[PDB]
Design a protein around this ligand. Structure first.
Ligand code: MCN
Ligand code: FES
Ligand code: FES
Ligand code: FES
Ligand code: FES
Lengths: 287, 161, 804, 152, 158, 286
């Protein structure tokens, strides 16, 4: 329950936050919504000497249309994502996924950037961002860079971020008008990380699938982009024989944990069932 | 210690706190506002919920220093100055929406924001809308009734039965 | 209105049978309850524990030096501080002892090793991290079925020589007790010869009561006065007083136990915990108050577990479905110390109500308790002293017998119910059931849910499954149960030697309002509302003019506390009997004032009138003033009474619960379609309060049957003991409940009322589990062990070949 | 005036009166009355006055009335407890009440003085082995209406 | 307000006070040492007596600012660290030298200084020696006995 | 009980205190032992804006013999006077008088200078200082001066002191070795101001009074020096006739208040009875 002592900082700009994180080293953690970091401080799994609160940095919150993307600032909250009529129009899968994350209180505080940077394979945004082909914008002492969500996650709590960097925004290509979408999650109860979940975006023309992309949540030490599974759907009618091939290709890349959500074999099979259900819902939406 | 100035239940508050002090403990231990409760160590139960700058916040998952400049309402701030209870406080009594009363401050504070978000919710919207708040006593059924009662009182018309 | 009718006056009382709104709600809805952690006293310090990372290990040493040197740390206690004392172990309600601070060894993960006392809970937490413990690990025992093997680990070295425990001979170092009841020889002869013998092993898995407020206290030794005040989460505050007197050597008049408002108990808060003992010792040493408040993780892993019974359960029958006998053996896993709350003579509680609602001529029950490297407990979580397990055993056994007989299980129950005319009914394991009308209640339930139609619907759905048209299966869960609540008669019910009576004291003020206190203690069950209703009706004084208190051992009359759904059977009776003493005195006063014989008076809601002359009367309010203003010559002034009530029997409420459950066989996800619960607890004091007790209990039953668990791995690690995994349903998961009743009064109770509070859990768990087992019966799954969560139901189907 | 006396399972006592000391030593002296009546040491008895929620109703301390009124009530309440203890002793010892006599802190069987039960044992029995004819526990109240004044 | 620093019962105290705050109110109200009592408004009764830099002082007739830098003992400071009563506290109990208890803190604090001034006083010296302290309950006779009892106990200690 | 607000000062020297009094004006008062001033603040009879505490001025405390005088600093406490064995040897009347003032607590705080400068006719020291023919040393912004105690008191709270002055010391002629002395006080109880009191010093030779001086306390709106009453004792045997003449001449100059101590006529007679008893005890001591 009780965290260890720390010093508290409120930087006024992105540049000041990055300088501070750079100065203070691994003893310092960025503080966003606090709804993964404060729980692990309370168990002393984390014992930072410094918290660098990003709250006064107005630039880190927002949803904007820029070129062919939507760019969402890292401090944008789950609640704000759900409330955005613009996102509901252009990227409806976001609202659908956010509504399956945590609970109202957590969603008022927790941020999209914190969800994406955390590195917990339980978080739902990572695989959604891989499904969407999003890019993460990072700023550090060495300047700006971009890393694909598909390349950001290496292990459990092991990502591509470097010392002194902040994830400042997530850049998401806007899918075609009329695309189908779904996020299908199997969970023990409200507020639980998935036993398995699948993110799907696809498009159709004349009874055939034109594009498809699939993300899998919490069925390996990272999110997964089920590249081959989506590819085998293209050109088909998304019926049971087509799905059978996608399911095999998705299951084969999973490597789930065995924990209170069940044995690894169950979780792999549930990735396949969630995939089938997601595809079906997305097929119905696509038009 | 850090110097903070904020507003709680409409009154100015000025205090000195350690950075690591959880907001729940600043509220309970320093401000003596002991309605808010602790029911867990993992952020699930919602017993600690307060209304903070228009948001439902689990105050066990925030440091007091994060609330510098904020406006907070706790359960002690809900009744009218004339003594009369709020619509939600009254509905919780009329509909038997509490037993041990431990979850009740957090339930009412969450529900206060829920009815601002959605003044006329369905039963499914209520149940989902209080998903962050656990109760051990009631089995939730009468809590849904309480919130429906409060909505109908606020709105001047009933919605669902 | 100035001259209200008899009906109007009765209505104003808000007495028996009324849906009176709760007095507690005013303070609780405003944050003005007073729970233990709300207490602040001058000089008060905070204490908490260094806990064991090991399940089974010798302690080689503990280094407290860095902790003691930290600014703001006032004490760090280990076993060595307590052992000169003989407070390194404490007695339990089961007659065993439990380690307070670990001495030579630890026996379960998270066991208390040292107690740090500091300025506040933030400094205490820092200091606990600075303590260093050196362990030597020992082989761990977690499988009770292996506990009595010749090479099973030696856990309880402290009682290695003690071959007689508190409940008779011990047959092995890890054996706690063997307890039996019933006709062994007759039951065995019946099974040896019966047409049909139906046998299964049902496990009631380990779960936890998890009240939203954890266990806690504030101890204050006043060293100027030599008096201890102890605020705490106590379901039985007077029992705690007497125990603390025995342990501490302070006399009872100098120990002021205060149970204030309690944020739920659900059996977790009956007995004493290490934290209470250590807070008290620390405060005695330091001479300043000491607060102890545990966190959730410690609550779930170190305080009273529930269940953990492995029940080999058999029914003997004719092919036509007459039940001839029941034979049950239980292997009970008690963890490292037997701390199982129970009447002292009943080490398996009232598990001997396991013949249930059925008329059978002979039965036998045997229970063996064993030690394992786990937290202690057993009795908790709306069990009524192992009645949860008793009911599960019989209601599951009815279903597996019905499957073997190829008979509808509703018809099998109906063929074997104890009939209304057979009450009071002596059951074949010794309990005399007080009253019951089981056919009427079963019929009402069956009519409400459309049972015969549901069976046709199910048959059609099964045919559709076999035709490949659905992957959903439908189950119909039935639980018809007989509870046993109200412990209990002085002949054989006691808590460590104190008979299980309870009590009420009622005092009427000159102006007609009332202060009344009882020996029970609410943790949310509405006593401050409902005891006033019983008084209101007896005395014709409005319930709002009556103040009810519990929990302060200086002021409340002695009682045995609140558990076993006993409050209404015991203190509810005492309240009625005490009120009747007052009424009898009032009648004497009235007769004197009105100048008539007592036998010429009649009662009319709130007054005595002269028979034949209704214009000659005295109201209770008038009599109350008269008792102070003009006491009749032969009477004492004032108007008050006490009763301590020794019950003649328990009360035996019953119910008929039916559940419809749909299950996806490919994911294992089950979803309750409908849940109907008929309860009959005799006369109903407050239907609104009963309904809320039922909704809460049914929600627990749901949780237990469908997901909750506390587990241990082969290394002794406690698993799932946090709200990350422990299934506490939110409003989204919790089914909508339908409730109903009949009224079959207890013939022996002063107001005909039975207990009810635990009925919904007792009857609900078998109803949910029966619906799941029923859904799979046409696929020959056999008995499916709880909990019925998604991976486990997936596994059932996997092994049946459903996923090929 | 009034007195309420309640004996705990282990034999110590809480007693309250309807009077209110302002320095006259009631918290010491009322315990002395009970001590003699029941053979319970005075330090094993707690005396309280003045909290209207908890003390039995009385008319207060003035007119040098405390000893005449609540002092009388204290003795009479203690004698009700004594009388109940006699019945418990009769049940335990399997004799008629009439066969028992009081001796300082115990009831003895007449002519068989080795057979006895102490007040302490009787208090425990009232909770542990209550006679079936009787209520459990061991306590009493008296509201004392004096027949005359006293004239020192 | 004035910043004061002093010692009370052996502990450092630091406070801000108005100059007009009477020492008795600083002790009772700000320090929560409520053994000291107020019995009058004219400096006669002595119920407010404390020991202050080796003197018996009526704390209702001194401002807290005047006590800046002082060392004060109040009745709470008389018992030993192990809880044992002082000879005077024990003597007042053994000899029945109090009834309501309201003059007792001031009587004992005056008496503590009296027995330092004169370890073996006669009855006339005791009666004169406590002339600044009024009692309503005892008629003084048992207070003289309590002081003599305490003198005997103290004089046996060495 | 509750005084009005004021500012509080701690000057470190006589010069500083006099400067502060002079600057602040009438609204500032010296604070010595506080046992007359604080009681009248608490009733709001006195509502000064400033108190000038003399506590830190060491040179105001002390007892020394200088030439033919004893010089006593104004801040010297009653308890110190009683405790001085030098004073008991040279001026034993002072210990006798001080033991008749107030009670132990009040004597630990109250000062000789505060008792003399107060102007309450109830105070005992003024008439004793008149008996003794004491001189008051005053320092103000205009320098030092000396006022005889016999010339210092004009009425209730009215004295010869001027704005900005402190009474710094009392200079007392030392009587001859062997002199007689007495202070005889009639009061209602311990701690009360006198119904009447008399201070006497005298010397004898050959059974005959050579010198005699008499002060009278609390039997007028000031202390009184009974000049004529002393004069008439000189040359006599201090026999009945001489004492009756001194009593008449003392009584004649009284003008007491009528209060709780009794009416004026009683208090005049009591001045005479106290004078007689004081002369008798002084005669025995001489
Ligand atoms: N014939 C009846 C029976 C009961 N009642 C009312 O129902 C309430 C429960 O009474 P009873 O059945 O006598 O049970 P207890 O009060 O003795 O409660 C104990 C029971 O309470 C249960 N319900 C709980 N509910 C809450 N809120 N908190 C707990 O800790 C609870 N713990 C569980 C467990 S475990 C137990 S053992 C009381 O207000 C009673 O007046 C009534 O109206 N008519
Ligand atoms: S205390 Fe449980 S969520 Fe805050
Ligand atoms: S009312 Fe008890 S936890 Fe909700
Ligand atoms: S209160 Fe009376 S002298 Fe101080
Ligand atoms: S004991 Fe009562 S005033 Fe002295």
């Amino acid at each position: 329950m009780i965290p260890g002592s720390f010093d508290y900082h409120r930087p006024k700009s992105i540049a000041d936050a990055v300088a501070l994180l750079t100065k203070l080293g691994e003893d310092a953690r960025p503080l966003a919504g606090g709804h993964s970091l404060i729980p692990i401080m309370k168990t002393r799994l984390a014992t930072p000497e410094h918290l660098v609160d990003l709250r006064d940095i107005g630039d880190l919150v927002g949803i904007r249309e820029e070129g062919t993307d939507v760019v969402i600032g890292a401090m944008t909250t789950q609640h704000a994502l759900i409330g955005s009529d613009f996102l509901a129009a252009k990227l409806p899968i976001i609202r659908e996924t956010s509504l399956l994350i945590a609970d109202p209180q957590i969603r008022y505080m927790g941020t999209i950037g914190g969800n994406a940077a955390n590195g917990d394979p339980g978080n739902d945004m990572p695989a959604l961002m891989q499904c969407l082909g999003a890019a993460y914008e990072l700023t550090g002492p060495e300047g700006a860079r971009i890393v694909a969500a598909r390349d950001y996650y290496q292990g459990a709590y092991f990502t591509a971020i470097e010392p002194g960097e902040l994830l400042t925004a997530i850049r998401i290509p806007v899918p075609p008008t009329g695309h189908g979408y779904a996020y299908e999650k199997l969970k023990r109860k409200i507020g639980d990380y998935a036993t398995a979940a699948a993110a799907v975006v696809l498009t159709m023309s004349g009874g055939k699938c034109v594009t498809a992309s699939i993300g899998l949540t919490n069925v390996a030490n990272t999110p997964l982009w089920a590249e081959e599974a989506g590819k085998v759907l293209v050109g088909t009618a998304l019926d049971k024989p087509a799905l059978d091939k996608a399911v095999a290709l998705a299951e084969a890349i999973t490597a789930p944990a065995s924990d209170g959500r069940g044995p690894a074999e169950y979780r792999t099979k549930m990735a396949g069932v969630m995939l089938r259900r997601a595809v079906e819902r997305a097929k119905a939406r696509a038009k | 210690k850090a110097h903070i100035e904020l507003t709680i239940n409409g009154h100015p508050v000025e205090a000195l706190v350690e950075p690591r002090t959880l907001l729940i403990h600043f509220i309970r231990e320093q401000q003596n506002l002991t309605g808010a409760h602790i029911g867990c160590d993992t952020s699930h139960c919602g017993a600690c919920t307060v209304d903070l700058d228009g948001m439902s916040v689990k105050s066990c998952t925030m440091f007091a220093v994060q609330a510098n400049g904020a406006s907070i309402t706790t359960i002690e701030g809900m009744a009218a100055p004339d003594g009369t209870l709020s619509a939600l406080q009254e509905g919780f009594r009329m509909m038997h929406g509490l037993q041990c009363g431990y979850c009740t401050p957090g339930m009412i504070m969450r529900s206060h924001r829920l009815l601002q978000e959605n003044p006329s919710p369905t039963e499914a919207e209520i149940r989902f809308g209080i998903g962050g708040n656990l109760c051990r006593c009631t089995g939730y059924q009468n809590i849904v009734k309480a919130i429906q009662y409060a909505a109908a009182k606020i709105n001047g018309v009933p919605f669902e039965e | 209105t100035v001259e209200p009718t008899s009906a109007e006056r009765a209505e104003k009382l808000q007495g028996m049978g009324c849906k009176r709104k709760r007095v507690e709600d005013i303070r609780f809805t405003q944050g003005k309850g007073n729970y233990v952690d709300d207490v602040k006293l001058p000089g008060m310090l905070f204490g908490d524990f260094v806990r064991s990372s090991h399940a089974h290990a010798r302690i080689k040493s503990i280094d407290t030096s860095k902790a003691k040197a930290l600014p703001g740390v006032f004490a760090v206690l280990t076993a060595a501080d307590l052992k000169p004392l003989n407070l390194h172990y404490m007695p339990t309600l089961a007659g065993d002892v439990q380690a307070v601070l670990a001495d030579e060894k630890v026996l379960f993960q998270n066991q208390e090793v040292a107690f740090v006392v500091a300025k506040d809970r933030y400094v205490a937490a820092d200091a606990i991290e600075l303590v260093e413990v050196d362990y030597e690990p020992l082989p761990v025992l977690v499988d009770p079925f292996k506990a009595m093997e010749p090479d099973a680990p030696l856990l309880r070295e402290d009682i290695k020589d003690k071959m007689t425990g508190a409940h008779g001979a011990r047959k092995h170092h890890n054996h706690i007790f063997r307890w039996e009841i019933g006709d062994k020889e007759g039951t065995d002869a019946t099974f040896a010869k019966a047409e049909v013998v139906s046998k299964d092993m049902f496990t009631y898995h380990r779960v936890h009561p998890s009240p939203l407020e954890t266990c806690q206290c504030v101890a204050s030794m006043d060293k100027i006065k030599g008096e201890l005040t102890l605020w705490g989460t106590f379901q039985a505050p007077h029992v705690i007083r007497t125990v603390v007197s025995l342990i501490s050597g302070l006399p009872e008049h100098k120990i002021h136990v205060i149970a204030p408002d309690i944020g739920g108990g659900f059996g977790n808060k009956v007995g004493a915990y290490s934290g209470y003992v250590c807070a008290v010792v620390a405060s005695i040493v330091l001479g300043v108050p000491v607060k102890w408040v545990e966190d959730r993780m410690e609550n779930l892993s170190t305080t009273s577990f529930a269940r953990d019974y492995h029940m080999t359960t058999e029914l003997a029958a004719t092919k036509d479905g007459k039940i001839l006998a029941m034979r049950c053996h239980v292997l009970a896993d008690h963890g490292a110390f037997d701390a199982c709350a129970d009447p002292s003579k009943w080490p398996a509680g009232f598990m001997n109500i396991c013949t249930g609602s059925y008329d059978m001529p002979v039965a036998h029950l045997a229970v063996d308790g064993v030690y394992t490297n786990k937290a202690s407990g057993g009795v908790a979580y709306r069990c009524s002293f192992r009645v949860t397990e008793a009911v599960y055993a019989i209601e599951r056994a009815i279903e597996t017998l019905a499957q073997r007989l190829e008979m509808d299980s509703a018809d099998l129950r109906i063929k074997n119910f104890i009939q209304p005319e057979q009450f009071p009914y002596m059951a074949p394991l010794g309990w005399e059931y007080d009253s019951g009308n089981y056919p009427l209640a079963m019929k009402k339930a069956m009519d409400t849910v459309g049972y015969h139609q549901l069976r046709a619907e199910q048959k059609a759905k099964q045919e559709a499954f076999k035709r490949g048209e659905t992957r959903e299966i439908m189950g119909i869960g039935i639980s018809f149960f007989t509870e046993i609540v109200g412990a209990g008669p002085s002949k054989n019910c006691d808590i460590l030697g104190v008979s299980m009576f309870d009590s009420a004291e009622i005092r009427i003020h000159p102006t007609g309002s009332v202060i009344a206190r009882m020996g029970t203690k609410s943790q949310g069950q509405g006593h401050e509302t409902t005891y006033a209703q019983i008084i209101a009706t007896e005395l014709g004084i409005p319930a709002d003019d009556i103040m009810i208190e519990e929990g302060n051992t200086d002021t409340a009359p002695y009682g045995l506390g609140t558990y076993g759904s006993r409050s209404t059977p015991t203190a509810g009776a005492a309240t009625a009997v005490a009120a009747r003493k007052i009424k009898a005195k009032a009648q004497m006063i009235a007769a004197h004032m009105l100048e008539v014989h007592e036998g010429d008076l009649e009662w009319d809601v709130d007054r005595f009138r002269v028979k034949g002359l209704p214009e000659k009367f005295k109201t209770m309010k008038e009599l109350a003033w008269a008792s102070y203003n003009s006491p009749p010559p032969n009477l004492e002034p004032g108007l008050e009474a006490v009763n301590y009530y020794d019950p003649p029997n328990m009360t035996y409420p019953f119910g008929a619960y039916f559940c419809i459950m749909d299950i996806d066989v490919d994911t294992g996800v089950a979803k309750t379609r409908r849940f109907y619960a008929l309860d009959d607890c005799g006369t109903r004091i407050n239907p609104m309060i009963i309904e809320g007790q039922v909704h809460g209990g049914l929600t627990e039953a749901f949780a237990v049957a469908m997901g909750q668990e506390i587990r241990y791995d082969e290394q002794g690690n406690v698993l799932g003991a946090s709200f990350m995994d422990f299934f506490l349903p939110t409003a989204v998961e919790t089914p909508k409940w339908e409730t109903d009743y009949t009224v079959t009064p207890s013939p022996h109770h002063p107001i005909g009322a039975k207990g009810v509070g635990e009925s919904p859990h007792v009857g609900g768990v078998p109803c949910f589990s029966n619906a799941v087992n029923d859904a799979y019966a046409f696929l020959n799954a056999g008995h499916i062990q709880m909990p019925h969560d998604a991976w486990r139901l997936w596994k059932v189907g996997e092994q049946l070949g459903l996923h090929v």
